[PDB]
Write a protein that binds this ligand. Sequence first.
Ligand SMILES: [Cl-]
Lengths: 109, 67
Amino acid sequence: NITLTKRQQEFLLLNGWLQLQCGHAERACILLDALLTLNPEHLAGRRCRLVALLNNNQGERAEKEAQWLISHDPLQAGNWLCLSRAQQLNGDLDKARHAYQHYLELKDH
Amino acid sequence: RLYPERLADRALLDFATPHDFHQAMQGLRSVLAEGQSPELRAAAILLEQMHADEQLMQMTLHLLHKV
Ligand SMILES: [Cl-]
């Protein structure tokens, strides 16, 4: 049994974001996968890994992770923007356009 | 322009932005070193590979006003 403390979860999250912000998308996914294995309910890590998967050209994993956030947090408009990009990387431009519309609608509330 | 796609990339990276470094890194490596799953074993090897970059990582995070 393995656990991370609250400060350790944030330290692992900031390092995952650092690699993303600094253009190391795969390192971000590697670090944030470990974070979300030990705390799969960490939303900030879910969002960071999602955009990390997009920049790592992993549209398949990104689509499922965009769906996960749409399910467990449907109010956040940024979830549909991520689904739009993932479905775009997956070639389904029709779906990507529909997910982008819901992103525009949800931004206006 | 009809659609603000020029702001899409900036919006994605804002969406991903979350709201002592040496000691914290050595502590996290300590915990991840015991995980047997592939995810923890992959991240433990990565954090060990970036060990020579701790000062650079702390400096960059400090400039980004995060750590
Ligand atoms: Cl030391």
